[PDB]
Amino acid sequence: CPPGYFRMGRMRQCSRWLSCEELRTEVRQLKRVGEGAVKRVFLSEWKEHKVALSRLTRLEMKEDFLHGLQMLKSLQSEHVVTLVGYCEEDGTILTEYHPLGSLSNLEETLQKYQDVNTWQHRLQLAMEYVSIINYLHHSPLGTRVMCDSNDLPKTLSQYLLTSNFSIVANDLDALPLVDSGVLIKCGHRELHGDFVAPEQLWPYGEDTPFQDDLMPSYNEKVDIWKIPDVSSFLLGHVEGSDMVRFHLFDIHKACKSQIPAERPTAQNVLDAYQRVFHSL
Ligand SMILES: Nc1ncnc2c1ncn2[C@@H]1O[C@H](COP(=O)(O)OP(=O)(O)NP(=O)(O)O)[C@@H](O)[C@H]1O
Numbered sequence: 001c002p003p004g005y006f007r008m009g010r011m012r013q014c015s016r017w018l019s020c021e022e023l024r025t026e027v028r029q030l031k032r033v034g035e036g037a038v039k040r041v042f043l044s045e046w047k048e049h050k051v052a053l054s055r056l057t058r059l060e061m062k063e064d065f066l067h068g069l070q071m072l073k074s075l076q077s078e079h080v081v082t083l084v085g086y087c088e089e090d091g092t093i094l095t096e097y098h099p100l101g102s103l104s105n106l107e108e109t110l111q112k113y114q115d116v117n118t119w120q121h122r123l124q125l126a127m128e129y130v131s132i133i134n135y136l137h138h139s140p141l142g143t144r145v146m147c148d149s150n151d152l153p154k155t156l157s158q159y160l161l162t163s164n165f166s167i168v169a170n171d172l173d174a175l176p177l178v179d180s181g182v183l184i185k186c187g188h189r190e191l192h193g194d195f196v197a198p199e200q201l202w203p204y205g206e207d208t209p210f211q212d213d214l215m216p217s218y219n220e221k222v223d224i225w226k227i228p229d230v231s232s233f234l235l236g237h238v239e240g241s242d243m244v245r246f247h248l249f250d251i252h253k254a255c256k257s258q259i260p261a262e263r264p265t266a267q268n269v270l271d272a273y274q275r276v277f278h279s280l
Protein backbone atom coordinates (compact mmCIF):
# COMPACT_ATOMS: atom_id res chain seq x y z
CA CYS A 1 0.00 0.00 0.00
CA PRO A 2 1.05 3.60 -0.65
CA PRO A 3 2.07 5.76 2.33
CA GLY A 4 -0.90 6.53 4.50
CA TYR A 5 -2.99 3.53 3.34
CA PHE A 6 -3.69 0.06 4.72
CA ARG A 7 -5.06 -3.25 3.47
CA MET A 8 -6.08 -6.27 5.53
CA GLY A 9 -8.35 -9.30 5.42
CA ARG A 10 -10.40 -9.69 2.25
CA MET A 11 -9.79 -6.06 1.24
CA ARG A 12 -8.72 -6.17 -2.36
CA GLN A 13 -7.63 -2.52 -2.31
CA CYS A 14 -6.08 0.12 -0.09
CA SER A 15 -8.02 2.45 2.17
CA ARG A 16 -6.81 5.67 3.77
CA TRP A 17 -5.86 5.58 7.46
CA LEU A 18 -8.79 6.08 9.83
CA SER A 19 -9.00 9.32 11.87
CA CYS A 20 -10.52 10.45 15.18
CA GLU A 21 -14.14 10.45 13.99
CA GLU A 22 -13.88 6.98 12.48
CA LEU A 23 -12.29 5.59 15.63
CA ARG A 24 -14.88 7.34 17.79
CA THR A 25 -17.89 6.12 15.81
CA GLU A 26 -17.06 2.81 14.04
CA VAL A 27 -14.87 0.78 16.43
CA ARG A 28 -16.42 -1.58 18.99
CA GLN A 29 -14.09 -2.57 21.84
CA LEU A 30 -14.35 -6.27 22.79
CA LYS A 31 -11.83 -7.34 25.46
CA ARG A 32 -8.42 -6.48 26.90
CA VAL A 33 -5.61 -8.57 25.42
CA GLY A 34 -2.42 -6.87 26.57
CA GLU A 35 -0.58 -4.26 28.63
CA GLY A 36 1.70 -2.55 28.64
CA ALA A 37 3.91 0.12 30.19
CA VAL A 38 2.75 2.57 27.50
CA LYS A 39 -0.35 1.08 25.87
CA ARG A 40 -3.43 -0.79 27.01
CA VAL A 41 -4.43 -3.06 24.13
CA PHE A 42 -7.95 -4.24 23.28
CA LEU A 43 -9.17 -6.79 20.81
CA SER A 44 -11.80 -4.84 18.87
CA GLU A 45 -13.84 -4.93 15.68
CA TRP A 46 -14.30 -2.51 12.79
CA LYS A 47 -16.68 -3.74 10.09
CA GLU A 48 -15.78 -7.37 9.52
CA HIS A 49 -12.19 -6.85 10.84
CA LYS A 50 -10.64 -7.78 14.15
CA VAL A 51 -8.34 -4.88 15.06
CA ALA A 52 -6.23 -3.93 18.06
CA LEU A 53 -6.97 -0.69 19.85
CA SER A 54 -3.99 0.58 21.83
CA ARG A 55 -4.78 3.27 24.40
CA LEU A 56 -2.22 5.46 26.18
CA THR A 57 -1.98 4.41 29.83
CA ARG A 58 -0.80 7.67 31.46
CA LEU A 59 -0.60 11.18 29.97
CA GLU A 60 3.03 11.04 31.23
CA MET A 61 4.14 8.18 28.96
CA LYS A 62 2.72 10.35 26.18
CA GLU A 63 6.11 11.08 24.62
CA ASP A 64 6.91 7.36 24.24
CA PHE A 65 3.42 6.77 22.80
CA LEU A 66 3.76 9.23 19.89
CA HIS A 67 7.26 7.95 19.10
CA GLY A 68 5.92 4.47 18.41
CA LEU A 69 3.08 6.00 16.39
CA GLN A 70 5.39 8.07 14.23
CA MET A 71 7.61 4.98 13.83
CA LEU A 72 4.54 2.92 12.88
CA LYS A 73 3.43 5.45 10.24
CA SER A 74 6.82 5.67 8.49
CA LEU A 75 7.81 2.01 8.81
CA GLN A 76 4.77 0.29 7.31
CA SER A 77 6.05 -2.74 5.39
CA GLU A 78 5.87 -6.53 5.49
CA HIS A 79 8.06 -6.37 8.66
CA VAL A 80 5.80 -4.10 10.76
CA VAL A 81 2.20 -4.44 12.00
CA THR A 82 -0.37 -2.84 9.68
CA LEU A 83 -1.47 0.58 10.94
CA VAL A 84 -5.22 1.08 10.40
CA GLY A 85 -6.02 4.36 12.10
CA TYR A 86 -5.00 6.64 14.92
CA CYS A 87 -6.21 9.62 16.96
CA GLU A 88 -3.65 11.76 18.79
CA GLU A 89 -6.31 13.66 20.75
CA ASP A 90 -7.67 10.42 22.24
CA GLY A 91 -4.26 8.77 22.57
CA THR A 92 -5.44 5.77 20.53
CA ILE A 93 -3.92 3.66 17.76
CA LEU A 94 -5.73 1.12 15.61
CA THR A 95 -3.79 -1.75 14.04
CA GLU A 96 -4.45 -5.14 12.52
CA TYR A 97 -5.22 -7.75 15.16
CA HIS A 98 -3.19 -10.98 15.21
CA PRO A 99 -5.02 -13.67 17.23
CA LEU A 100 -1.86 -15.73 17.73
CA GLY A 101 -0.54 -12.75 19.62
CA SER A 102 2.94 -12.25 21.00
CA LEU A 103 5.92 -14.26 19.71
CA SER A 104 5.95 -15.61 23.31
CA ASN A 105 3.06 -17.92 22.40
CA LEU A 106 5.13 -19.75 19.76
CA GLU A 107 5.43 -23.08 21.53
CA GLU A 108 1.79 -22.99 22.66
CA THR A 109 0.72 -22.13 19.12
CA LEU A 110 2.59 -25.04 17.52
CA GLN A 111 0.23 -27.67 18.99
CA LYS A 112 -3.83 -27.69 13.77
CA TYR A 113 -0.57 -25.79 13.18
CA GLN A 114 1.78 -28.82 13.28
CA ASP A 115 2.08 -28.80 9.50
CA VAL A 116 4.68 -26.16 10.48
CA ASN A 117 6.16 -27.44 13.76
CA THR A 118 9.35 -28.49 11.93
CA TRP A 119 12.90 -27.25 12.07
CA GLN A 120 12.51 -25.90 8.51
CA HIS A 121 9.64 -23.58 9.47
CA ARG A 122 11.23 -22.50 12.76
CA LEU A 123 14.47 -21.60 10.98
CA GLN A 124 12.41 -19.64 8.44
CA LEU A 125 10.77 -17.94 11.42
CA ALA A 126 14.30 -17.05 12.63
CA MET A 127 15.16 -15.69 9.17
CA GLU A 128 12.04 -13.47 9.30
CA TYR A 129 13.11 -12.07 12.69
CA VAL A 130 16.57 -11.20 11.37
CA SER A 131 14.89 -9.65 8.29
CA ILE A 132 13.00 -7.28 10.59
CA ILE A 133 16.24 -6.31 12.37
CA ASN A 134 17.87 -5.76 8.97
CA TYR A 135 14.88 -3.64 7.97
CA LEU A 136 15.03 -1.56 11.17
CA HIS A 137 18.78 -1.04 10.64
CA HIS A 138 18.04 0.28 7.09
CA SER A 139 14.64 1.88 7.65
CA PRO A 140 12.97 4.90 6.00
CA LEU A 141 13.88 6.76 9.21
CA GLY A 142 17.55 5.70 9.20
CA THR A 143 19.20 3.02 11.36
CA ARG A 144 16.76 2.31 14.25
CA VAL A 145 17.55 0.15 17.30
CA MET A 146 15.05 -2.15 19.03
CA CYS A 147 15.95 -0.75 22.45
CA ASP A 148 13.17 -2.36 24.55
CA SER A 149 14.74 -5.87 24.62
CA ASN A 150 16.53 -6.39 27.91
CA ASP A 151 15.43 -10.02 28.33
CA LEU A 152 13.99 -12.82 26.23
CA PRO A 153 10.29 -12.61 27.29
CA LYS A 154 10.30 -8.84 26.90
CA THR A 155 12.03 -9.03 23.49
CA LEU A 156 9.46 -11.54 22.25
CA SER A 157 6.59 -9.43 23.69
CA GLN A 158 7.30 -6.80 20.98
CA TYR A 159 6.59 -8.99 17.97
CA LEU A 160 3.42 -10.71 16.87
CA LEU A 161 2.79 -14.03 15.18
CA THR A 162 0.56 -13.66 12.14
CA SER A 163 -1.92 -16.41 11.22
CA ASN A 164 0.17 -17.22 8.11
CA PHE A 165 3.19 -17.57 10.50
CA SER A 166 5.19 -14.54 9.63
CA ILE A 167 6.52 -12.24 12.32
CA VAL A 168 6.00 -8.51 12.52
CA ALA A 169 7.35 -5.86 14.87
CA ASN A 170 4.59 -4.28 16.91
CA ASP A 171 5.95 -2.14 19.80
CA LEU A 172 8.15 0.63 18.42
CA ASP A 173 7.93 3.01 21.38
CA ALA A 174 11.70 2.74 22.05
CA LEU A 175 13.37 3.16 18.63
CA PRO A 176 16.25 5.64 18.81
CA LEU A 177 18.17 6.77 15.73
CA VAL A 178 21.83 5.87 15.08
CA ASP A 179 23.80 8.05 12.62
CA SER A 180 26.91 12.43 11.99
CA GLY A 181 28.13 11.34 15.41
CA VAL A 182 24.73 10.13 16.66
CA LEU A 183 24.92 7.09 18.98
CA ILE A 184 22.22 5.81 21.37
CA LYS A 185 21.42 4.54 24.84
CA CYS A 186 18.50 2.24 25.71
CA GLY A 187 17.05 4.21 28.62
CA HIS A 188 18.56 6.16 31.50
CA ARG A 189 18.70 3.33 34.04
CA GLU A 190 21.61 0.94 34.51
CA LEU A 191 21.25 -2.31 32.59
CA HIS A 192 22.56 -5.62 34.00
CA GLY A 193 23.03 -9.24 32.92
CA ASP A 194 24.01 -11.18 29.83
CA PHE A 195 20.97 -10.69 27.58
CA VAL A 196 21.87 -7.04 26.99
CA ALA A 197 24.99 -6.45 24.96
CA PRO A 198 28.12 -6.01 27.14
CA GLU A 199 28.63 -2.45 25.89
CA GLN A 200 25.17 -1.81 27.45
CA LEU A 201 26.61 -2.61 30.88
CA TRP A 202 28.21 0.01 33.09
CA PRO A 203 31.91 -0.04 32.10
CA TYR A 204 33.66 1.62 35.07
CA GLY A 205 33.52 -0.98 37.85
CA GLU A 206 32.04 -1.10 41.33
CA ASP A 207 34.23 1.73 42.63
CA THR A 208 32.49 4.29 40.37
CA PRO A 209 28.73 4.42 41.01
CA PHE A 210 26.44 4.44 37.97
CA GLN A 211 25.86 7.85 36.41
CA ASP A 212 23.91 7.90 33.12
CA ASP A 213 25.77 11.07 32.11
CA LEU A 214 28.97 8.93 32.17
CA MET A 215 27.43 5.88 30.47
CA PRO A 216 28.89 5.71 26.92
CA SER A 217 26.40 5.45 24.07
CA TYR A 218 26.35 2.65 21.51
CA ASN A 219 24.87 1.57 18.18
CA GLU A 220 22.75 -1.02 16.41
CA LYS A 221 25.18 -3.86 17.21
CA VAL A 222 23.28 -4.32 20.49
CA ASP A 223 20.51 -5.86 18.37
CA ILE A 224 22.95 -8.26 16.68
CA TRP A 225 24.08 -9.45 20.13
CA LYS A 226 20.55 -10.64 20.91
CA ILE A 227 19.84 -12.53 17.65
CA PRO A 228 21.08 -15.99 18.85
CA ASP A 229 18.71 -15.93 21.87
CA VAL A 230 15.66 -15.21 19.69
CA SER A 231 16.79 -17.68 17.03
CA SER A 232 17.36 -20.39 19.64
CA PHE A 233 13.93 -19.81 21.21
CA LEU A 234 12.28 -20.12 17.80
CA LEU A 235 14.11 -23.36 16.99
CA GLY A 236 12.99 -24.91 20.23
CA HIS A 237 13.49 -28.61 20.78
CA VAL A 238 11.88 -30.54 17.93
CA GLU A 239 13.62 -32.87 15.52
CA GLY A 240 16.50 -31.14 13.79
CA SER A 241 16.75 -28.18 16.20
CA ASP A 242 20.10 -29.24 17.62
CA MET A 243 21.31 -30.00 14.10
CA VAL A 244 20.53 -26.37 13.18
CA ARG A 245 22.13 -24.98 16.35
CA PHE A 246 25.32 -26.84 15.38
CA HIS A 247 25.47 -25.11 11.98
CA LEU A 248 24.64 -21.75 13.55
CA PHE A 249 27.19 -21.90 16.38
CA ASP A 250 29.80 -19.84 14.59
CA ILE A 251 27.56 -17.18 13.11
CA HIS A 252 25.98 -16.93 16.56
CA LYS A 253 29.49 -16.75 18.09
CA ALA A 254 30.24 -13.79 15.81
CA CYS A 255 26.99 -12.29 17.09
CA LYS A 256 28.36 -12.48 20.64
CA SER A 257 31.68 -10.77 19.94
CA GLN A 258 32.47 -8.64 22.98
CA ILE A 259 33.74 -6.01 20.51
CA PRO A 260 30.64 -4.58 18.77
CA ALA A 261 32.42 -3.71 15.53
CA GLU A 262 33.34 -7.40 15.08
CA ARG A 263 29.72 -8.50 15.08
CA PRO A 264 28.12 -9.17 11.68
CA THR A 265 25.44 -6.99 10.20
CA ALA A 266 21.87 -8.26 10.16
CA GLN A 267 22.29 -8.81 6.43
CA ASN A 268 25.33 -11.02 7.10
CA VAL A 269 23.41 -13.14 9.63
CA LEU A 270 20.46 -13.50 7.24
CA ASP A 271 22.78 -14.54 4.38
CA ALA A 272 24.41 -17.21 6.54
CA TYR A 273 21.01 -18.40 7.78
CA GLN A 274 19.91 -18.83 4.15
CA ARG A 275 23.03 -20.78 3.16
CA VAL A 276 22.58 -23.03 6.19
CA PHE A 277 18.88 -23.43 5.41
CA HIS A 278 19.30 -24.58 1.81
CA SER A 279 22.28 -26.76 2.60
CA LEU A 280 20.21 -28.81 5.11
N1 LIG B 1 -2.12 -6.11 17.05
C1 LIG B 1 -2.13 -6.97 18.07
N2 LIG B 1 -2.71 -8.18 17.90
C2 LIG B 1 -2.72 -9.04 18.92
N3 LIG B 1 -2.21 -8.89 20.15
C3 LIG B 1 -1.64 -7.69 20.29
C4 LIG B 1 -1.56 -6.69 19.33
N4 LIG B 1 -0.91 -5.58 19.84
C5 LIG B 1 -0.62 -5.92 21.07
N5 LIG B 1 -1.06 -7.17 21.42
C6 LIG B 1 -0.85 -7.88 22.68
O1 LIG B 1 -0.79 -6.96 23.74
C7 LIG B 1 0.59 -6.66 24.07
C8 LIG B 1 0.75 -5.17 23.94
O2 LIG B 1 2.04 -4.76 24.25
P1 LIG B 1 2.71 -3.51 23.56
O3 LIG B 1 2.05 -2.93 22.31
O4 LIG B 1 4.16 -3.90 23.42
O5 LIG B 1 2.37 -2.38 24.64
P2 LIG B 1 3.44 -1.62 25.48
O6 LIG B 1 2.73 -0.68 26.39
O7 LIG B 1 4.35 -0.80 24.53
N6 LIG B 1 4.33 -2.76 26.34
P3 LIG B 1 5.97 -2.40 26.71
O8 LIG B 1 6.82 -3.39 25.97
O9 LIG B 1 6.07 -2.54 28.29
O10 LIG B 1 6.50 -0.97 26.25
C9 LIG B 1 1.44 -7.51 23.12
O11 LIG B 1 2.64 -8.01 23.71
C10 LIG B 1 0.49 -8.63 22.71
O12 LIG B 1 0.37 -9.67 23.66
Ligand SMILES: OC[C@H]1O[C@H](O)[C@@H](O)[C@@H](O)[C@@H]1O
Pocket residue numbers: 037147148149150174185186187188189
Ligand atom coordinates in the same frame (compact mmCIF):
# COMPACT_ATOMS: atom_id res chain seq x y z
O1 LIG C 1 10.42 0.82 28.84
C1 LIG C 1 11.12 1.74 28.00
C2 LIG C 1 12.61 1.53 28.24
O2 LIG C 1 12.82 0.17 28.81
C3 LIG C 1 14.17 -0.10 29.22
O3 LIG C 1 14.64 0.72 30.31
C4 LIG C 1 15.20 0.08 28.06
O4 LIG C 1 15.29 -1.09 27.24
C5 LIG C 1 14.87 1.39 27.13
O5 LIG C 1 15.42 1.42 25.82
C6 LIG C 1 13.44 1.76 26.95
O6 LIG C 1 13.44 3.18 26.55
Ligand SMILES: [Mg+2]
Pocket residue numbers: 157158171
Ligand atom coordinates in the same frame (compact mmCIF):
# COMPACT_ATOMS: atom_id res chain seq x y z
MG1 LIG D 1 5.98 -4.29 24.41
